[model samples]
Target: VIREHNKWILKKVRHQGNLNTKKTLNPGKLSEQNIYNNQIGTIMTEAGIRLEKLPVVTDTKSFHEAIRDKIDKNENQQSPGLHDKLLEIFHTIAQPSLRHTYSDVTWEQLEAGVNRKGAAGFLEKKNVGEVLDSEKHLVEQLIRDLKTGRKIRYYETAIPKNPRVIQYPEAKTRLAITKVMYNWVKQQPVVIPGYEGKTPLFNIFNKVRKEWDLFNEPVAVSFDTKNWDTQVTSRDLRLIGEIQKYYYRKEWHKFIDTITDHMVEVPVITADGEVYIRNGQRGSGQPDTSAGNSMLNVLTMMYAFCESTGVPYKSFNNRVARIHVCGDDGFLITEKGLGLKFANNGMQILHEAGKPQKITEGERMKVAYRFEDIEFCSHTPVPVRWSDNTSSYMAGRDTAVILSKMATRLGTIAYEKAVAFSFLLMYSWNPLVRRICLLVLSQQPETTPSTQTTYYYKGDPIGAYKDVIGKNLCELKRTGFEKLANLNLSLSTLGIWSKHTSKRIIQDCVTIGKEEGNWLVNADRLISSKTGHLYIPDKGYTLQGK
Candidate 1:
């Protein structure tokens, strides 16, 4: 049954892609239906809604109505039935067993893991004092569990990202050992502290201001690995070896090493509803520390690529394109002449260097100009509240009396005008603050700039702003919000669709989902009302909903 479901998902995605690739009058509508279905799959899977209950969505309006009916029915629904006890026998085989290894973990480490934000759910549910008793049995339990290893299962699902919806065979695991490793991996710093928030935005914005700068005509090219997480196996080998070389903590590495040493398992439900786990030494994409490990692997490769090609570090030269990395997605900003060779060379270097672990770029390489406009949607408005104690405001906005006053009055006025007020804030010199301003103002649209002056780079005051805005003002205008849906436009550009967020962009999108009726049907409504505009220095455009 899982195989057939996977087949069905791929078939739908392929059909959507085929229709989109052809010269259709309305590719936006085509991709819209695909993403709608993608979102539906995610909602169903997360809610434990069974596969057979899934509905077909050939038309948007009727599909929304149909899915709403299914959702309502499921809410009042219980676990329904799981009577096919044929798979029950495997439960004995799958139960986790304790290990005999003597653990080196200190009580302080266990306490820290439990107290840490976003700890394991079970750990969070337990009484801190009880869990941290003098016996420290739970600590030993987790440590030995790590030593024993875990069996992870993955499910084939759909994710709603741009270009089109994709079939993602994602991992599912809830092991305490994995959580400890996750927390530990997060503590390890790749870039220096306080520097992760900074990107190439403001510097590139500065370049376009002057014609003599090397990147005055910077070319923007984005490259991403085909299936990054799956390709990067041997997480234990790659991550532990690097951890050993750079910063060695013997026992900690031991704990981390055990995560990937075990075999990968996938559960498939058959037509007769008999479920079985397919065991294999498969590639990694486990929720544990695999994401963190995958991030470091690509970053390691990026460093190697830089060294091998003799590319100037953005920090040292402060002249060339600063490479923006969000996992597998790499954005290169270089001079028009060099962009061709630079991007091509890096692609070759990364592709070949990644050979040992089986990474490939496939056909997913493309280039654009520095100022080429791309559209995205920010659904939630930035939080605004003044703080008298600190003489500042909350959220990402700066501490300015005038701006705070204007921002406080934002919702009262139109979203269009609100955007114009905030676009001016992008001029703030602090790169970190500028991004905050971008996130704060991105959802609000401005059709006609209060000041209609043609600045350089096609009157786009900041090209980075163009890359982060919603659908209307884009060159691919007719495609609607299809190109802008579910983009993880936060500090990290994951290139994959993410339903997770903080008081940040991702969370706001979920909020939009709630406000716009259904998460699946209104996924593209992140920019709110139809009047959402893509702000440009010249004339901006506002989209009337299709």
Candidate 2:
């Protein structure tokens, strides 16, 4: 059933991609995203770097504890019974579990799971504490069932970062439980700052899709956590359980403890194969810790500065990109100078989150997380900088669909043909495309194989390459040769596409192709609407499919 649903969505997104790719008269594969995803600036070879005087890292626990104190004062003023409210939220949260929606009920029970949906048929008839207590029990069972041996997986990042759990499957489950905790917390009917599910999918505005547009002539800043996921070490999450007690009931506190304790389990390995009961949260876009950690970080900032004051919390939220975070990478695009203002505050929050313990050390020293122009996105597009005496390719793609089919159908012993079409089959999000973009520029030797044609040498004539491409493509003896002919053109076209390959162009291709493969790709996403500048929403949202 899941497989069927996926296919349904894949068709939708691909159709959207084709429609979008064709709308622009430029037959090139580049879309609006490929062009203006970032706030365009000097097309220089380097991303500018300017350092700022570092700030001190305050004890975050102190701030969190203070939040409780403030909350207590608020209670004295007028409040939501934190414990009672938390329990109420927890019971509501565990309903999906009770109904066996995500679970396998047929295996556990012959007929059906609980029919409760929302509080309609389901007010816990048990003592409110008892029912919520049982929910806590479910938390324990999930914790106990959490499998270990997960390792951290890193993206092919430009920086040094690899965050994942030793157990991928266990990480998925742990992420689920973390989401439940986060959801319950975010929906607490309180004005507590949200970093979990509060993130606007594309924007905090608009209609069909949730997408935010910040790339502008404004202050744009991006800062990444120095070892972000793991920064919220086991010690930090443990502290969360203790600190949250002031804000939640005892049962909810244990549930927090259970989840944190299991954030990384006993006996694990890493991508480098080092073995340990790993510390820190995974930042490889896995684990519920992604949002939960943000929740923890934002929670502290709000506590430090009471809202409705000099820098009112509501106003602060308004200044910052209200709900935008992907693990440790921070994105803030605000008014001309507001981003820097927000970045300064945000850096402090990151510093607090990254510290493993309450430390007086590094008070005089800190790492500049980075404050840049309004050109921040996941993969900042840099001019192709990898070694190729002459830049070998432009922002380009694999073979076209017609060529892909012809190469496959016309040949026999077609392992090579299959390999050729495989490149075209790739989506915009594929890692291989990133690798190829890096590789195509490297100097290749000047010799042709006896069986394979080496059409051109490094910096040789474009005609030489084109000549071999046309000659090799034929129906006669058309086995892998036809496919190789396609490769020759793909490589040749790279040089023609543009003088340089922007980092994002390849990444965008991989993402779109991957989306076409996935079943849930949306046809209408990230709708951008304005007056004369009516932004097209199709490709902007569609490229995000994977």
Candidate 3:
């Protein structure tokens, strides 16, 4: 059995060997060599298997390095570079029709419908024929109407009562005309809003229709010379002429020109009362003719003349001297001075009457004289006294002593009065002129004699004087004015005046003087007389008898 198995194995090996030899030698034979070269090995190579000489090659590092380099390069690129591409992708995703093509059938059908010349083109170009034809029809109708001499009276039409009739075209025409008319009418410049029939359009349309006569001729004109004459006289024509002469002479006349040669002298004048001085030398830096100063001087001299003629006048204590003068009409009174005439015209002047010649109102005529120079008439009482026994002297002395102690009391009162007057003027349209006068007088410093004894014993004497006497005096004066203002109202009903005046009287009359001077007696008597009647002080009779 061993020998037979060996024989069979040898026979099979020989058979396989013979087959492999045959396959290799013959190209068409299926052999292990042929299979290895062209089938198995070739198949393995085609399948990406290396069968010749293989080695374990690891490319892990190179593979990973390549991936890292790619990632770094991508990170270094600007974001917009990738962002724009992503946005393009997103846009395409959102709008799918951007990439879609119209079907050929649909495109052809659309083209046929709109091709005006029956020429095939793009669908868009072929789709507007109906609209174009409708517009053409409208234009043709407009042209026909224009050529037919038919009047187009555009107007807004009212809606018909019935709704079945189609009047939309007429309604549209009316609406369009109404809009145009409204805009055109609004664009014309007129003062008033609405009420358009009376505007410039009415005249314009009338002119266009030849239904109205337009005033094309220049109207009859007249130039009134009254204003020119008034202006010339108002500035004093003679004064203006003099100024003009001076201006021409100083500017126009030159040297080497003689007065005989020019037939006119240079009009320059000097401050030293020299006119037309030679060589145009100004005297004391004075202009040739100061019209302003000359006019002022004339006015001043006129005022002085009036004063010298015993013209009674009232002076205003302002930076500029102001006075009002009046002369008597013989019918009113013979040999009448300024006083009687002033008294008569005071009311008329205050009322601004035109019965008298209309003198320039609000004229601030200066009184040309100082306060000391003013000669008060005999009727006006002088507050000064020469004798020691006189009440005026005693009052003056007492007031002076009291005033010397309080330096600023009189000043304060004056300042307060001025402030009050300003306030009153601000509040009242017709401020009482007397109130201003009274306030001004109340602020005047007392003219009293100063004595060594009074100064030595100053302590409370001045205080006593102010409180007892001064207080009563001020209250009495104030009350008298208050009564005049509130004549229609009861004295008790004058709320603020009653309270404040009473309080001031009581507060001021705290101390009393025991001296037997004339001022003391007069003050005491005045206080006693007006205690209850004038100022209702808190401490009633206490100050009365003192």
Candidate 4:
């Protein structure tokens, strides 16, 4: 069997004589109905039906790989949490149907569906000037967003290997409507997740402003889902609905479901320049706006939990420091540390909230003991100061891929690589990746930073190193570290620029190229709901390539 792409691309190999020949095997959520013409089935054993109570299948080679992986993992350092790590649990392996994504499990009787106070997609453009007159501020913003150049080719994933495209008008309308809803949402006095602004960047990218030592039992906890999006059903939407209708209401009310059936997945482009649809999410599927709303819902519930259990807020020199949040992620200073008790309690809460979905809620969703991570407010996720550094990659995968290609094109040439590497390294947010890749650069070279041909690798792309024992690309790149001096930090001309506020690294890190932009199709025009700066539309998303 041979390997290709990220997985082993092979086929039925009863005969090893024709080893030179290759075949492709496919895996997807095909239903049991053979009448559908594309029906497929999997093999399973009794044990697979035991723990999960279902027929789970495993390929022979894959089964051994898993066993070997376990032995290899014994050498890995334990994760830095005072409490034990939770196992990933899945209720089902099927891809959720379109209806499941729009389930109604939140508030009210199951029969009583949701609407905007009896108003559906209801609007009176007739009073274009008279209707909420302050709407112009939002109207102008949407109009401006539509004029920007963009692309969707950077998507790392989608439902299928080949996905469909989302149009410009569709993306724009979603933005116009979401912007209006967001304007009101932002003004509400909710316990938003953002550190400075209720945005992900605010929570992760501003460096440690205050010292961590003096805060009260400050703990950071994380939660995980087998399939964060597909595992979600309509019941989850209603829970989000309850948070929407919570406070300042003396009169009877009807909850609103912001995302309707029509508002789920939208489209983007491929690395090879093809359009594809990406799933929408209640959390970060649409990082620009959806995540903000999702974070608020969780906070409201957690805050209500605190009030119920009599968990008091800590006072600084004398001020009440609020709990922190980043999307569905959260942290707080607890007089009673959020240990096993906290995790167990939260599971019950999530379970009660998720019963309507009819999937594995109690076991699949997990909460950690105390805080497992210490993150500063920078998009770059840094970990604990001391000990074994086992951490998730917080950096951009697309950024890594692009820079990797750039380095591969360059040879032993130092200065030219240094200049390009200088700006590119800023995008390498992972600490481990940075520590491993030693950037061999010119210490104090003259006229070397400029002049493309003279500075970059002039050798053959097929050439090999004479001195190094390990010659392949993977072997040589496994070494690097130390200092990154001799380069000018003030040169600053990296990243795609966003209209949002940011000195350099902020708006600049946004690097998606779309419709009529250089990376993909023609630089025609209008709307980009990129991860950091998003202006979504009513059809539900711009790049909802979430």
lDDT of 1 by residue, 302-376 (tens): 343354456533332434544444444445555766566645465555454342222335422356653423110
| Best model per TM-score | 1
lDDT of 4 by residue, 1-546 (tens): 112221211121122221111111122111111011010001011101111221111233343232222211111121232011110100111122321222112112211211212111111231232222344444445434322321211122111211221122222233343342342234233333333343323123222223233445443333432223433333334434343333213121221332322223322221222222223333222322344444433443353334334444221221122345544344343333443244445544444433111234453223322332333232323222111222222223222232333333322244333333332233333322231121222122232332232112222111111111112111222111211110111112232112221222212222332323222101101112343232221111111000
Per-residue CA lDDT of model 2 for 1-546, tens digit only, reads 222212222222211222111111111111121111011111111212111111111233343232222111100111223223323333322333222212211212311111112110011133323323345454345543432322122111111121112233232233334434433333333323333244222221121011223424334344444434444444545544444444443435555555455443322222222222223434342344444555454443332222212354333535433333344444444453444444444444434334322233432212223221112223221111112222111112233322222222221212221222222122112222222321221112132211111111222222122232221111112113232344335434433223344343433333433432221111101110101121111110011100
Q: List ranges where model 3 is wrong by over 4 Å.
A: 1-334, 337-496, 499-507, 512-546
- Report lDDT (Cα) of residue 325, candidate 4: 52
User: Model 2, residue 60: displacement in angstroms?
Assistant: 38
> What TM-score, over all chains together, does every model reach?
0.36, 0.34, 0.17, 0.34
Q: CA lDDT of each candidate?
A: 0.32, 0.29, 0.22, 0.27
Which pairs in model 3 have colliding backbones?
114-126, 269-288, 321-366, 396-448
Q: Give the TM-score of candidate 3.
A: 0.17
lDDT score, candidate 1, position 410? 16
Predict model 1's lDDT versus the native: 0.32
TM-score, predicted candidate 4 vs. hidden true structure: 0.34
lDDT of 3 by residue, 1-546 (tens): 222211222222212211111111111111111012222223223323333322111233343232222211111112223223322222321323222221112223332322233221111122134424444344234323423433232111111111110111122221221222221112222211111222221122112212111222111111111111111111122332232222232322221021111111112111111111011111111111122222222232222323333442232111121221111101111122332333333333322211122233442211212111121111111122121322210111111111112222212333333332222222111112222212232233242212211111122222323342223322222212232333313323422123343333322222222222222212222333433222222221111110
On TM-score, the stronger of 1 and 4 is: 1
Q: How well does candidate 1 match the true structure in TM-score terms?
A: 0.36
